[PDB]
Amino acid sequence: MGRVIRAQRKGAGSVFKSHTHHRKGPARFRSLDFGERNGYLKGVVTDIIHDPGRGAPLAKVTFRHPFRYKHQKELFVAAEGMYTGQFVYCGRRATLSIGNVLPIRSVPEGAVVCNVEHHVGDRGVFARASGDYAIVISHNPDNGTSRIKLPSGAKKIVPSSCRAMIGQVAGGGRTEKPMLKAGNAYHKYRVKRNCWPKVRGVAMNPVEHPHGGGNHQHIGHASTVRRDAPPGQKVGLIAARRTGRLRGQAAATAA
Amino acid sequence: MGAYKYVSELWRRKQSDVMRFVQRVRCWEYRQQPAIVRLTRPTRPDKARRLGYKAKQGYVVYRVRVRRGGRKRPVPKGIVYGKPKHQGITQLKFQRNKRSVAEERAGRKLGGLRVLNSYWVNEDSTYKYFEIILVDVAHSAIRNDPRINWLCKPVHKHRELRGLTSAGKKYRGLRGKGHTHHKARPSRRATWKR
Amino acid sequence: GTKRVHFVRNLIREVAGFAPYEKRITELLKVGKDKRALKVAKRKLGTHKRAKKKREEMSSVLRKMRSAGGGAGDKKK
Amino acid sequence: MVNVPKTKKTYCKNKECRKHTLHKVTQYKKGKDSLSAQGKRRYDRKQSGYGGQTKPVFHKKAKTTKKIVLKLQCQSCKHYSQHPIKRCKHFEIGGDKKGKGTSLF
Amino acid sequence: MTTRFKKNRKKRGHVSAGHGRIGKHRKHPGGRGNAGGMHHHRILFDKYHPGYFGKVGMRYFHRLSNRFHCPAVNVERLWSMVPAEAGAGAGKAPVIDVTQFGYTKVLGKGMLPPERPIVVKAKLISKVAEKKIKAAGGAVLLTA
RNA sequence: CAGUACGAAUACGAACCGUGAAAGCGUGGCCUAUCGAUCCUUUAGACUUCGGAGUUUGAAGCUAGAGGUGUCAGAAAAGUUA
RNA sequence: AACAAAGCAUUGCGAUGGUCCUCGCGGAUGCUGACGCAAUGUGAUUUCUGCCCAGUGCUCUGAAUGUCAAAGUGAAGAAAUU
RNA sequence: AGGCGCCGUCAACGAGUCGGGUUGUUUGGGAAUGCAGCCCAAAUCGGGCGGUAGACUCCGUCCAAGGCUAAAUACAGGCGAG
């Protein structure tokens, strides 16, 4: 049989983890007391600070409104075009301006949003990463459902009460340009949850992977491996729909 | 005899009449309350009155919550190492019963007290519930009662653990006497395998 | 008149008597629960069927608490 | 393969005739079941899911070759006999008929 | 040669029945049955030993027949009769006596060789279809 | 096989038939002889048996034949290591 | 000359993510969100990357037909056993 | 209060228990040891047992799901001695 394949090493352990202490703080969207046509939540962006845990920026927002419990703060997710000294509005009668957060119901159809909730008050799930955005296609006055298209193209049915932020996430185009030092890849790995560099399965000797062994390097068996297959076996193309470059489309996806 | 017969008659019928309603309703409580619950009332006074209940100081009654299922055996995903007559993980089920585990848990937390006996107070779909009588040894009222001072004797400390409970006698096969009973009495380790 | 035809407490009592006579005989062929199906099934199947289905539920039983306590009382005189 | 008549005359083994009478030939299998046998020793002795010595069902097996494979059942008394060893294969039957001689056609 | 497990021979008494050969009684089933319960014992003695110990058996009374020739209940002449279910008289070798033997079973060629004037006597338990009809009477003896 | 099993032969007797004139021949194949234990299962025949009596159901079993073993006097069974 | 590497492809993943550790709690995923995370193939640039879905792998739809377990359910039936 | 005799008579008699199935473990324990786990589930002159299952009178024994309890046994021996 074998010594454990790296995929089990994910598992638990100090080596597989991110530097979670290092991450900058929780960036959850403030669950509104109530009302909010301008300023029972008014923010000023004061600063824009990088998030190591995702590599795109946050905007530092204060947020100052009262009560007790009152709760306010802090570093909310940046959208494109957010600047120091711009106003942020968070809630139901917030102005429809980029950087403001409000429930989907309040948003006009055809407006790009980010930090969209799965479930109301979870504060925001979908459209997060750099330069991505969901697109709110349908509402109507929809008591029942607000239809949003996520960046993959899947059309998601969400409760109209789910809040989102208008605009697309900052940092777009990050993906376009090539890393162009091994060392650039290296530090970028250090920050995230990953064991790098990666040795190819074929490169190893048999004990380390299903791919390993053989004088010349090659996968002894067919690469694409079972949904049924157990952990340790399941490597390569897991249960692949198709392979090789030709004749597909993006995901389509029914409701 | 008395009133104690009716509740005893009810508790047969866990599934039926007032008892499925009232005890399924007390499980809203039982799921909420911990795996130690001390209470000041027996749920069954009948089967308290027939496992040893006198209201008298040093007496406590306590509910214990024990998982349903068997036992699952270390290590999975670094598995034995041995020939397959001895490989077994969920396949084996403990040969202590779920009632005795509850006796152990209870006597561990209430360490200055000794389990007298125990009874059944239901199950839902993952928990099995027991209520257990533990009786102080150390206080005068137990000592100056000749129906319950037999517990006090130093030989009787930690009796649940050494299997001298009623439950501990029953899983040890000591329910019979005669024919059969021949591998249980006086002990499951008894002849030393001579 | 109807139900059953006819009589009432004695008819409850016949049925209440038929039910241990049906039950003791299931118990003398074990289980209970499959024999309670078989002992009923291997027979004509109407009055007994409804009467059996209620005993395999939930059931009677305030009335059961009422009758058993009188029978216990009256076998304790 | 064999012409064997389904209907033959033979001696009885059995003690109610203990003389010669008409007999009917048939190839036989049933198996059992209701479980008291090896089948029980296995049900119990699974014992970590081990079929174990319930397999001598394999080797992958194959050589082919028999003995006559019969029970000849009396049509006039119900007492009737199986026959002793000599070497066949395979075996044909139907109601026979016949390896008929003679042919002009 | 030795390590006493290379010339020895072998270790445990096997290769002996299967494939090498001689010895035990070997290859078994075969009858098996009855259990440890409804089981033995029937005590059995041939009538020639009561004829040894007729003359010296002077705790058994002589009676209608001459002084050598004794009524003797064989149940109270058989050692280990009390833990046995019944005491039976077996018929080997002569009797040259005019005895009266009481038994819980007797052979047919156990009466017949001491036909030589005898009274062969069933005890009540010889039947054993005799009336323990709740009632009272007869019994089996007890001793170490 | 010089004493060791299954097999095989070479004959009988007992029962039971044929053909045949019958004496006889006929205990598988011109002769020189042409295969399988052990659990289990299968059935055959009759009978035996399963723990108060009583009664049905099956079981347990004797004796005999057929179902795998050609590693053929009987394992349930693929390779590499540089 | 081996491994890594940046670069190039397939595939799984809609979140309580799939995946790893764990009986479990929980954790690692991720206090992240498909411009993201895993699982793999190959290995700068430059020009390119043909034909084959028969076998093996894997995946798709199956409201319909031959096979396809258990239970509950029906038949003989005192059961059970078929 | 206790005993004996006579007199009727009877209640401290313990439920997810007895019991059956599904899946296991263990045992000499076999349809028949003991225990675990999932599902189901009685009666209360009624019930339980007698080495597979089902009518009767019974025969024969015994009242679970409760308890305690001296003495006799062990001590590859702390501690004293032969």
Pairing of strands B37-39, B59-67: antiparallel
Q: Which residues of B touch C62 (CB under 8 A)?
A: 17-18
CA distances for B84 relative to B79, B95, D51, D58, E66, angstroms: 11, 20, 12, 21, 80
Question: Quick count: other Cβ atoms within 10 Å of Cβ B132?
Answer: 26
User: How close is the nearest chain D Cα to the Cα of B171, in Å?
Assistant: 22
Question: Quick count: other Cβ atoms within 10 Å of Cβ A65?
Answer: 17
Q: Which residues of B14-44 are buried (b: 16+ CB within 10 A; e: fewer)?
A: eebbebeeebeeebeebeeeeeebeeeebbb
Cα–Cα distance between A108 and A52 in angstroms, integer?
33
CB contact under 8 A, C57 and B16: yes
Residue type present at position D27: Q
**Chain C residue with the nearest C-alpha to that of B16:** C58
**Chain C residue with the nearest C-alpha to that of B6:** C65
The reply to whether B90 touches chain D by the CB within 8 Å rule is no
Contact A210/A235 with Cβ under 8 angstroms? yes
Question: Quick count: other Cβ atoms within 10 Å of Cβ A238?
Answer: 13
Cα–Cα distance between A116 and B74 in angstroms, integer?
43
Cα–Cα distance between A56 and A174 in angstroms, integer?
9
| Nearest alpha carbon to residue B100 among B58, B162, B176, B150 | B162
Q: Order of strands, edge to edge, in the sheet holding B37-39? A: B37-39, B59-67, B127-136, B113-123
Q: Which residues contact D40 (CB under 8 A, 6 or more apart)?
A: none
Instruction: Specify whether the backbone of C13 is left (phi greater than 0), alpha (psi in -120 to 50) or beta.
Output: alpha
Q: Which residue has the tokens 């030393």?
A: B192
Three-class SS string for E18-65?
CCCCCCCCCCCCCCCCCCCCCCCCEEEEECHHHHHCCCCCCCCCCCCC
Phi, psi of B21, deg, nearest 5: -60, -60
Tokens, residue A110: 């055809």
| Nearest alpha carbon to residue B83 among D50, A4, E12 | D50
Cα–Cα distance between D7 and D68 in angstroms, integer?
16
Q: Which residues of B touch C68 (CB under 8 A)?
A: 9
Cα–Cα distance between B168 and B132 in angstroms, integer?
13
Tokens, residue A217: 């390097």
Q: Which residues of A11-44 are buried (b: 16+ CB within 10 A; e: fewer)?
A: eeeeeeeeeeeeeeeebebbebeeebeeebbbbe
Tokens, residue A59: 């905007």
User: How close is the nearest chain D Cα to the Cα of B131, in Å?
Assistant: 35
| Nearest alpha carbon to residue B173 among B97, B91, B106 | B97
CA angle (A124, A127, A130) in 5-degree steps:
125
Residues 15-44 of E with CB under 7 A from strand F: 18-19, 21, 27, 29-35, 37-38
H/E stretch holding C3 reads none
Report the structure determination method. Answer: cryo-EM
Tokens, residue B30: 């039982």
Contact B121/B106 with Cβ under 8 angstroms? no
Contact A196/A189 with Cβ under 8 angstroms? yes
The reply to whether B16 touches chain C by the CB within 8 Å rule is yes
Contact D72/D25 with Cβ under 8 angstroms? yes
Q: Which residue has the tokens 């289905």?
A: C53
DSSP B109-145: HSTTEEEEEEEEEEE-SSEEEEEEEEEESSSHHHHT-
Torsion A181-A184-A185-A187 (CA) sign: positive
The reply to whether B22 touches chain C by the CB within 8 Å rule is no
Tell me the sheet residues that pair with A50: A57
Contact B170/B159 with Cβ under 8 angstroms? no
Chain-centroid distance, C-alpha A239: 24
CA dihedral angle for residue A64, residue A65, residue A71, residue A74, rounded to 10 degrees: -30
Contact B12/C61 with Cβ under 8 angstroms? no
User: How close is the nearest chain C Cα to the Cα of B10, in Å?
Assistant: 8
Resolution (A): 34.0
ω into D98 cis (within 30 of 0): yes
Three-class SS string for C48-76?
HHHHHHHHCCCCCCHHHHHHHHHHHHCCC
Cα–Cα distance between B180 and D33 in angstroms, integer?
31
The reply to whether B10 touches chain C by the CB within 8 Å rule is yes
Q: Which residues contact A62 (CB under 8 A, 6 or more apart)?
A: A43, A44, A46, A72, A73, A74
Phi, psi of E103, deg, nearest 5: -135, 165
DSSP 3-state of B5: helix
Question: Quick count: other Cβ atoms within 10 Å of Cβ D77?
Answer: 14
| Nearest alpha carbon to residue B52 among B154, B175, B145 | B145
Cα–Cα distance between A164 and A122 in angstroms, integer?
11
Nearest residue: Cα versus C1' of F64: D82
Instruction: Specify whether the backbone of A163 is left (phi greater than 0), alpha (psi in -120 to 50) or beta.
Output: beta
Residue type present at position A169: V
Chain-centroid distance, C-alpha B84: 33
Nucleotide nearest to C74 (CA to C1'): H11
Q: Based on C-alpha coordinates, what's the Rg of chain C? A: 14
User: How close is the nearest chain B Cα to the Cα of D48, in Å?
Assistant: 6
H/E stretch holding B68 reads none
CA distances for B47 relative to B118, C64, D12, angstroms: 9, 20, 73
CA angle (E66, E72, E76) in 5-degree steps:
160
Nearest residue: Cα versus C1' of G73: C37
Tokens, residue A163: 């809040």
Which of B85, B86, B89, B92 should be substituted to probe chain D, the one whose Cβ sees the most D Cβ atoms within 10 Å? B85
Contact A64/A41 with Cβ under 8 angstroms? no
Q: Which residues contact E60 (CB under 8 A, 6 or more apart)?
A: E54, E70, E71, E72, E77
Q: Which residues of C touch B17 (CB under 8 A)?
A: 58-62, 64-65
The reply to whether C57 touches chain B by the CB within 8 Å rule is yes
Cα–Cα distance between A214 and A200 in angstroms, integer?
14
Residue type present at position B27: C
CB contact under 8 A, C59 and B16: yes
Which residues from D are below 8 Å from B when comparing CB atoms? 47-50
C touches which chains (3+ CB pairs under 8 A)? B
Nucleotide nearest to D56 (CA to C1'): F76
Contact D48/B87 with Cβ under 8 angstroms? yes
| Nearest alpha carbon to residue A203 among A193, A211, A191 | A211
Tokens, residue B71: 């036992």
User: How close is the nearest chain B Cα to the Cα of D46, in Å?
Assistant: 10
Q: Which residues contact B116 (CB under 8 A, 6 or more apart)?
A: B51, B52, B133, B134, B135, B148, B151
CB-nearest to B16 from C61, C72, C76 is C61
Nearest residue: Cα versus C1' of G33: A126
Cα–Cα distance between B132 and B167 in angstroms, integer?
11
Q: Which residues contact C22 (CB under 8 A, 6 or more apart)?
A: C39, C40, C48, C52
Nearest residue: Cα versus C1' of G34: A152
Cα–Cα distance between B78 and C19 in angstroms, integer?
57
DSSP label of B75: P
Please give the span between the terminal C-alpha atoms of chain B, in angstroms, as a whole number: 50
Q: Which residues of B153-179 are buried (b: 16+ CB within 10 A; e: fewer)?
A: eeeeeebbbebbbbbbeebbebeeeee
| Nearest alpha carbon to residue A165 among A247, A228, A94 | A94
Nearest residue: Cα versus C1' of G60: A241
Contact A246/A239 with Cβ under 8 angstroms? no
Verify if strand F has an atom below 7 Å from the CB of D76. no
Nearest residue: Cα versus C1' of G44: A180
DSSP 3-state of B85: helix
- How many residues in total does chain E contain? 144
**Chain D residue with the nearest C-alpha to that of B83:** D48
CB contact under 8 A, B84 and D47: no
Tell me the sheet residues that pair with A62: A44
**Chain B residue with the nearest C-alpha to that of C76:** B1
Q: Which residues of B touch C60 (CB under 8 A)?
A: 16-17
Burial of B5 (0-12, 13-18, 19+ CB in 10 A): middle
Tokens, residue A219: 């996968």
DSSP 3-state of E105: strand
Three-class SS string for chain A?
CCCCCHHHHCCCCCCCCCCCCCCCCCCCCCCCCCCCCCCCCEEEEEEEEEECCCCEEEEEEECCCCCCCCCCCCEEECECCCCCCCEEEECCCCCCCCCCEEEHHHCCCCEEEECECCCCCCCCCECCCCCCCEEEEECCCCCCCEEEECCCCCEEEECCCCEEEECCECCCCCCCCCCCCHHHHHHHHHCCCCCCCCCCCCCCCCCCCCCCCCCCCCCCCCCEECCCCCCCCCCCEECCCCCCCCCCCCCCCCC
Three-class SS string for chain D?
CCCCCCEEEECCCCCCCCCCEEEEEEECCCCCCCCCCHHHHHHHHCCCCCCCCCCCCCCCCCCCCEECCEEEEECCCCCCECCCCCEECCCCCCCCCCCCCCCCC
D/B touch flag: 3 or more CB pairs below 8 Å: yes
**C1' (H76) to CA (D56) span, angstroms:** 48
The reply to whether C74 touches chain B by the CB within 8 Å rule is no
